[PDB]
């Protein structure tokens, strides 16, 4: 027997997220001591991003830009960075380099997608924008998603430099420079990353799709929070616990 009609229902909550607070805002963090932000209870409304965006790269892992509306995401986190384009290729999973060893290790098992656009008209500075700071030596390399905010003076010999600068003794921190007429590969980039899990979990952020009424005891094409199928919907006596 074939189905006759579709039934679509989603939670009745609408407010602007907004994305502009994440993307559009100014003076975001340096590469270390980066920041994490959490987003809930809003309409997805990506179409404004599709129209407005001029971003020079999109790449997504485990998801595609078509089939992106009509998805409900259980948790959303956004991370913002100031970066030099070689690091922009480095931010991919599995790579090697200063970033992947020292700063912002990113796991190969990941479901998000990462966006970059070039900020040279704003981030660069005549005389250099020294405020962007990065770390050059560490005794071992970090596991994914944790920060360090530290200073313990690096020793490059058998003898100590006694917590002060001297022979074979370096301060671990150094400053990027970006200028007018910058090297096109060197010049600064801004990168944003989003991370989520797409299944088996109550969600709050759902796409811009209107709900309809549901009809019982008929073969229908249903969509509940992205889960589709064909079948007869009937009453049940299964007492689900609050997290299920």
């Amino acid at each position, epitope marked *: 027997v074939q189905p006759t009609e579709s039934i679509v229902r989603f939670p009745n909550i609408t407010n602007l997220c907004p994305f502009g607070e994440v993307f559009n805002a100014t003076r975001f963090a340096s590469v270390y001591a980066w920041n994490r932000k959490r987003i809930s209870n809003c309409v997805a409304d990506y179409s404004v991003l599709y129209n407005s965006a001029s971003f020079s790269t999109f790449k997504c892992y485990g998801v595609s830009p078509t089939k992106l509306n009509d998805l409900c995401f259980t948790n959303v986190y956004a991370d913002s960075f100031v970066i030099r384009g070689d690091e922009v290729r480095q931010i991919a999973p599995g790579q090697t380099g200063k970033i992947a060893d020292y700063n912002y290790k990113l796991p190969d098992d990941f479901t998000g997608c990462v966006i970059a656009w070039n900020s040279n*008209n*704003l981030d660069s*500075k005549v005389g250099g924008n020294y405020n962007y700071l990065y770390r050059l030596f560490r005794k071992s390399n970090l596991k994914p998603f944790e920060r360090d905010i530290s200073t313990e003076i690096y020793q490059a010999g058998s003898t100590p430099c006694n917590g002060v600068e001297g022979f074979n003794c370096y301060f671990p921190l150094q400053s990027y420079g970006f200028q007018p007429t910058n090297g096109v590969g060197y010049q600064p980039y801004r990168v944003v990353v989003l991370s989520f899990e797409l299944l088996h979990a109550p969600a709050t952020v759902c796409g811009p799709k209107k709900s309809t009424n549901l009809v019982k005891n008929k073969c229908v094409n249903f969509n509940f929070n992205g889960l589709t199928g064909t079948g007869v919907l009937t009453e049940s006596n299964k007492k689900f616990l609050p997290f299920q």
Partner: antibody
Amino acid sequence: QVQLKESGPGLVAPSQSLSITCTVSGFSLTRYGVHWVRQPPGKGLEWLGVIWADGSTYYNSALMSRLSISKDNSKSQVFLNMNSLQTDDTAKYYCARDGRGYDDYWGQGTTLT
Amino acid sequence: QIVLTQSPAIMSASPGEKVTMTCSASSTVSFIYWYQQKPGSSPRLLIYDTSNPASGVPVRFSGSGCGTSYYLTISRMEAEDAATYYCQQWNTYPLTFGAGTKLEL
């Protein structure tokens, strides 16, 4: 002290040429950068500026004929020369240095035309 | 980028009559530096990024702006005599100097 000082300022003539030099002490021209700014009488200032370690040059100008930087890189002085500068320009000429930031120091020279 | 400036002509009856200075710019500018001048003789002294002061200037200053428009606010004492202000942008060449005229008596 860290100092900027102005030396051989231009003096009145019927001839429309004018010369001015500025001299620096307490820092080397290889260690920081110095920027050069001009004011017409009764008007805001006008700017020529360049950022370098040494030997580099940058310019933007509404006119550039006969015009490029002139420099005596023994730390002695920096020099300016134009055929018609007396009528065209330079009631006052100013000598100024910049660093990374919040270390910016200015010197003022007065040109007779 | 070209930048454009407005100023009043005004007669005071006391200090504490609040004062504003404004600049408007032809295109997006990200970084600006803040400067004050006394008439008659023209040394230069600077108030820099994040609107923090240099040495040798009164503490009562604060600056915050919005795109294509920059504002800082001053309340009391000598600035009524001493303040003439210029606005300049340092993101890309040429570094246009800007123009204007301001007075209080």
